[PDB]
Symmetry: D2
């Protein structure tokens, strides 16, 4: 029916299913998971792969013999299951040293440490076969206006990303970078708060081709933005390197609900866009099984992420393929949207009386867009209420 397979490219962070349930106001409700157990259980659910922060895989401050052993055991689990590691990242947010940032910490020694910690993990990510290296600058920002000169912080952020690009080029690595925006939490305001801000920043890097975005559903929704619209701009720019899928109920703390939860209609339009555009990267879930759940509930929530993607994929494809919907799209002039405004050129447009002097503004204004009929056909398809 809606059964996931490795072909569907579903991936999960170790820190997702492995979340112990500690929140601002509460203690852990679940024991820590061995990464080996997570890889095995996710493979059984039909996942394609898993992702990690450095410190998820190797406990912070492990010796060289400890690090080697943690990686060896994980690699054996991947080999035993056929699971992949398409993406990795660095934890630049948990340890108290990062309380004012990693790459943009006011303290220079912390900025240098953050870069060395990242570089060590890039080497490991390449060893495990990752194609994308995510950076979430969760500690980059401020609670107050004087704490952070944002122009200086952006200079430091550019310097850091430029050094990382120099490093990967020097080593001949194929890996590319993906910046993950978030507007706030845990800092009062975070730098590069949206997909737009991250895309703009990339254009100022020395080697912009090496960098894209890793947008997260709930993050754009924490700014009340339209996630499908932001994804469309990322695709338009050629910068959708990776994506984080989850749910969020509007403007509040980062909930990280399972995908499909939260804004259901936005999830529908997102899947419609990813499929229409031919996005070929991982369908990665960055979610937290609520702390109300036991281990059985963790795996049920993970399974639900994949199931909801596959239901929505079916419904979006049926919408686009329906002759009645195709007629409604023409009635709404989606065909005309895709035609050039002035392929004839500037001079021809200026000399066209039909575009101004002799344009019947009133007749054009009277023409309905027929968007409500189109949207109710979309609702009917999502809900399986066609006919």
């Amino acid at each position: 029916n809606y059964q996931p397979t490795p072909e569907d490219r579903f991936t999960f962070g170790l820190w997702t299913v492995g979340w112990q349930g500690r929140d601002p106001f509460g203690d852990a409700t679940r024991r820590a998971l061995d990464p080996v157990e997570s890889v095995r259980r996710l493979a059984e659910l039909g996942a394609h792969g898993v992702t990690f922060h450095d410190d998820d895989l190797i406990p912070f401050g492990s010796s060289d013999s400890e690090r080697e052993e943690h990686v060896k055991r994980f690699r054996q689990a991947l080999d035993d299951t056929g699971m992949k590691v398409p993406m990795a990242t660095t934890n630049l947010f948990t340890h108290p040293v990062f309380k004012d940032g990693g790459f943009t910490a006011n303290d220079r020694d912390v900025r240098r440490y953050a870069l060395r910690k990242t570089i060590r993990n890039i080497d490991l990510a390449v060893e495990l076969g990752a194609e994308t290296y995510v950076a979430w600058g969760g500690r980059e920002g401020a609670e107050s206006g004087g704490a952070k000169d944002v122009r200086d912080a952006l200079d430091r952020m550019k310097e850091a990303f430029d050094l990382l690009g120099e490093y990967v080029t020097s080593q001949g690595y194929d890996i590319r970078f993906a910046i993950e925006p978030k507007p706030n939490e845990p800092r009062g305001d975070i730098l590069l708060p949206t997909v737009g801000h991250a895309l703009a920043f990339i254009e100022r890097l020395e080697r912009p081709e090496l960098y894209g975005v890793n947008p997260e559903v709930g993050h754009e929704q924490m700014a009340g933005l339209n996630f499908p619209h932001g994804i469309a701009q990322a695709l338009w720019a050629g910068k959708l390197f990776h994506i984080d899928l989850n749910g969020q109920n509007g403007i509040k703390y980062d909930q990280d609900l399972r995908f499909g939860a939260g804004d259901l209609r936005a999830a529908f339009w997102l899947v419609d866009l990813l499929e229409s555009a031919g996005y070929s990267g991982p369908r990665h879930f960055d979610f937290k099984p609520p702390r109300t759940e036991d281990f059985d509930g963790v795996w049920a929530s993970a399974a639900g992420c994949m199931r909801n993607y596959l239901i929505l994929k079916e419904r979006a494809a049926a919408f686009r393929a329906d002759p009645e919907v195709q007629e409604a799209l023409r009635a709404s002039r989606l065909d005309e949207l895709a035609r050039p405004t002035a392929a004839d050129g500037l001079q021809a447009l200026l000399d066209d009386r039909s575009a101004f002097e002799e344009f019947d503004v009133d007749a054009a204004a009277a023409r309905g867009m027929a968007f409500e009929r189109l949207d109710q056909l979309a609702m009917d398809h999502l809900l399986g209420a066609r006919g």
Copy 2:
């Protein structure tokens, strides 16, 4: 005391003081103002200049003899007062023809009309001496996911802006363009919803040097974003061509309160940044005197915009000049933020044991940032409560 002068570069839209008070749920509470009266009253308050949409200055559908007369009378008022016109824009949002957009309307004939209407007004803006031409795509967007293919809409938006750049180049005009973001209202979601999205879009235009942003305080705040942070990114990019100043009380409808109202502390940090950065453009107010007000209240609200800017300018300068604040900034390592992370280069950083192998993470983590003391000195300066 806090008396404005033309030197301070304060400007106002005709549509601001001239707002009749019609809202979604109410009729006009004030008669229309003649633009000549607005120019005269604003000059008396110490303004530098005024801005206009085409249809604010010339009623929509005026004949050639009518248009000429409206412009002649306005030019005489400017000449009588010494007032300038630094910026103009096009109304692509009021007339029902624009119900689905101007530049990104699904209907091709409407897109062509929108461009011709804009070009006619660029000529007038140049005649009146404007240096910046704003575009607010208030109707560009959607209420529903199927109504608007956002990739196609961005193609049409780029085509429009590229044609406008070709036009100004062909005529030898000195004018430059400024895109004004807004996240929503009047469309459910608007394209290019934030400063970041607009900056990213500009990088894809044929002649990016001709285009910048016109960010508005209340617009970024309607997405819960930090306006000073967004302005810093615009400055970092070299794209702060113009700005709209006002107030907003968080995430709701676009209030357009007088500047200083709304988020007072954010207004303080904004003025601090504009002054520190040496922003040289107009200090333009895009505000609505509340519909509770009579004409005396309109002018009081306009005067308050300028007064609040000047109070905050004084307090921000006193903050930065205070020796105790300068000491606190060093205690918080703002000096170290401005120093390069690795001027020594990538190889040197990799070979530096002090940056990783021999870095004392615990001692670094124990060092307080001293941001609370710094922020309370900022509060004390804003409130005039020092000593």
Copy 3:
């Protein structure tokens, strides 16, 4: 299939389908509708009835002969169609006299006028057979802190509602009042901003039994609140006299989308609650067909409101009736939630060692709530993806 009938008790405001499309930033896109035409077209769609503000039915400032004729024509249309008028209200928000409020205007003469205008329309509402009289205090509030002493305003609000209760009692009318909350828009902040605030206020009235709430989906969502939770509190209090159904995409301007649009999952849980609780009042839609639409689109959007309610009613009933869902509800201890905490009484609870001294906190904490499995069964039912 999902065909509405008068039995389903669907009602619409004249101002909904009759909305001309004027928004803060745009002119009307549709001609005014005759109320007679609206009654006829809604009856053809399967509606039960219609509602009105005074000034929707009788243009403001009509003479006695004009008023009589407008009512006569409307009554004939109701008689011709079998349509009902279950609710009416007063427009205390459009006319510029109400710029600072009706019942809570600072000007005493305006407060008295607002009461007389309301009383005149109560008489008409009773003549047309209305059971509920709504009050939306859209102008009651402020943009600034000094403009409105809120304790004094609440005194005036109570005085107004008490006089209206005295009036209906004096005339022997059966009609009851319903207060409609909204947090903001068109005032910066509106008094009685949520269902909770309105319920609390009612408890201070002289005759609280005469007053309930008319909560609106989009209004509670403009404060980021859970609409189903608020409806549950209203039901718990015995105060759900009427309801307004529509859609809203999070925290922004009041969108008034068709019901089902906006937060789809919240619409599902709402219908589930109304049906489970046996709510017997009108299913009233307070929505705006987007201004993109022509008259055909207006009727399509109205039809979609009713269709979406009926789809969701089917899916919620199937969820509750499913044996697998009933098992999941027991697994999640919804049965135990409905049992008294201490029917044995305070003394027995104090003397129960099993409740404290001998309670195994660790074993209780280890028990998963199984909420994720339950919620995925709810998702599967909503989407028609069961098996």
Copy 4:
């Protein structure tokens, strides 16, 4: 200058200054404080007293000899300093047993445990001299619609509060209860989400006189509501038993900034209201020193809470006392707001032609409210920019 004294009634929670800095995404940045040290340091800053959750004072699962010793040491610190304990509360949110709630947990045994844990701490609160017992139901609510029947949960909430009222009456205690609303966090949606919802709920309790509200600045602001307006409604109801003071930058995670930070103008209008109304209870701060700070920064942030209250108290008093402001208040008809609408009675109002038949609507509408002038005088007073 702005030096606090015990007379000013400033209080702090042990969990405020004692916050170790653990957030959703980060480890502790500060060691735990001994409550004895906190009492001593706060007394030195000019505080009046301190408040506690049970588990802040006595580590969870302490023996009878341990509990006795922790209380003895704390009582000695209070005696050594002259500090008071005006309020206490129960931690019904940290321990994993409370993952689905205390009073409204689906599991009946957990509800009974929550009541016994609360009752034990009420006895201790009375021993330490507390006048108010706060309940924050942070775990009462849901992430999903099926998890929690809200009518049943409200039945259980009422049963719990009724038992607590029976208990305090049986023991002859003078203590009263204060319910603390919050809209969300840590649950997706929390029951009793606003001041209004809590006030409404209290009216359904068996002994409503024993219960009031403990509203928190940042909590109402997390729903985008006007905190001063909500406080005014609480005062109007006679239910402002206690208050939590802090700051919040709009609609996001609960920031708990020092008081004065966040929405500065709202803080001004709040202090103005508390002082005007003669609120006599504790001025309690529920704030978190940001985790960027060391122990010196903790005490600086605490001191800043009190300093900002005292600055704003001075500015609000100067505003109200200014003859020019008194004139502006009359110009804006605040005097008329405080006069009864119809002291003459319903019949007299109906028979008054001046209130309807002969009311000049146009002349009334033309009268400006003069609110902008009034608000700019308020701004000038707050900023110390008068003349």
